[PDB]
Design a protein around this ligand. Structure first.
Ligand SMILES: COCc1cnn(C)c1C(=O)Nc1ccn2nc(-c3ccccc3)nc2c1
Ligand SMILES: [Mg+2]
Ligand SMILES: [Zn+2]
Length: 313
């Protein structure tokens, strides 16, 4: 109860910033996560034994793929932690608790292939979940881990709260299906400009949390240029492996996934920042003003990619 987690001074300060990078030292990521739950939620949100056991069954069920791994899980959870600290009074105790848990869990047991590939390969997960295939698998793994003995970090919630937290987490994890982002952001844009956006309306809270989730998921683009650039290598190492595999099933893959189309990567980063990230961070800044530094940083990295194309690095 009387056991603070700290962090050395550079981390203690840089962690509160949106562009913080959790670094190359794996063995600190759990302590970083716990440090965030504590400052965001209080030392009393979670029995320390149950949380430490949950954090390590989660870690152990992420795979060692180049991008969709334990380090992405914690990065995503960090960005969420930033958003919540900068808007601390807009969210319930249940929302704060389950959204960081949602983010640590959001890619559980990912294999490093798109929903798309699962369906083209006819993987059993695509027979059991026809849309948001991996994302329903993700929530499903989270519940599995939650039901291991000693793992139920939610044990001490009323029966009511418990069902509402699992519903927040479920909805939150589904939202990271980027195919649902476009619909969601459009409606949020319109609802905001027609002054109809109502945060006591629960289905409006849902769309906002959906958007935060996309924001945190995509936060590689809000980092210092060299973090942004080296993360894109990891991203393409998955995409081009998926492409290879498409080819092995006898299918031309989309250019994104074709390692014979490396030369066009800056062009596709631009498309990506213009069709996806900029609009994501724009609407989110409109809705939660103190998220602006994600927007600002995202535009800086768009401008670094432009610089690449022009041969200026
Ligand atoms: C779904 O995105 C996940 C994600 C998360 N964080 N980031 C930076 C990404 C991310 O790079 N996305 C995208 C999107 C669209 N294209 N098109 C290309 C491309 C097209 C033609 C030729 C070569 C490449 N490369 C990407 C990368
Ligand atoms: Mg995912
Ligand atoms: Zn993710």
């Amino acid at each position: 109860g009387l056991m603070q987690f700290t962090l050395p001074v550079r981390l203690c300060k840089e962690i509160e910033l949106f562009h913080f990078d959790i670094g190359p030292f794996e063995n600190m990521w759990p302590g970083i996560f716990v440090y965030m739950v504590h400052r965001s939620c209080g030392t009393s949100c979670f029995e320390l034994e149950k949380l430490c056991r949950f954090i390590m069954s989660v870690k152990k069920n992420y795979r060692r793929v180049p991008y969709h791994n334990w380090k992405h899980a914690v990065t995503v959870a960090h960005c969420m932690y930033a958003i919540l600290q900068n808007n601390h009074t807009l969210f319930t105790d249940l929302e704060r608790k389950g959204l960081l848990i949602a983010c640590l869990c959001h890619d559980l047991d990912h294999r490093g292939f798109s929903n798309s590939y699962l369906q083209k390969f006819d993987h059993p997960l695509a027979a059991l979940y026809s849309t948001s295939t991996m994302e329903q698998h993700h929530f499903s793994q989270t519940v599995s881990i939650l039901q291991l003995e000693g793992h139920n970090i939610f044990s001490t919630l009323s029966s009511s709260e418990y069902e509402q937290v699992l519903e927040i987490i479920r909805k939150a994890i589904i939202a990271t299906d980027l195919a649902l982002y476009f619909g969601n952001r459009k409606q949020l844009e319109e609802m905001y400009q027609t002054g109809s956006l109502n945060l006591n309306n629960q289905s409006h809270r849902d769309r906002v949390i959906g958007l935060m989730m996309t924001a945190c998921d995509l936060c590689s683009v809000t980092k210092l240029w060299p973090v942004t650039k080296l993360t894109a290598n990891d991203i393409y190492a998955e995409f081009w492996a998926e492409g290879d595999e498409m080819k092995k099933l006898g299918i031309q893959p989309i250019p994104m996934m074709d390692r014979d189309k490396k030369d066009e990567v800056p062009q596709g980063q631009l498309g990506f920042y213009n069709a996806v990230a900029i609009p994501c961070y724009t609407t989110l800044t409109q809705i939660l003003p103190p998220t602006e530094p994600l927007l600002k940083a995202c535009r800086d990295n768009l401008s670094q990619w432009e610089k690449v194309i022009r041969g200026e690095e």
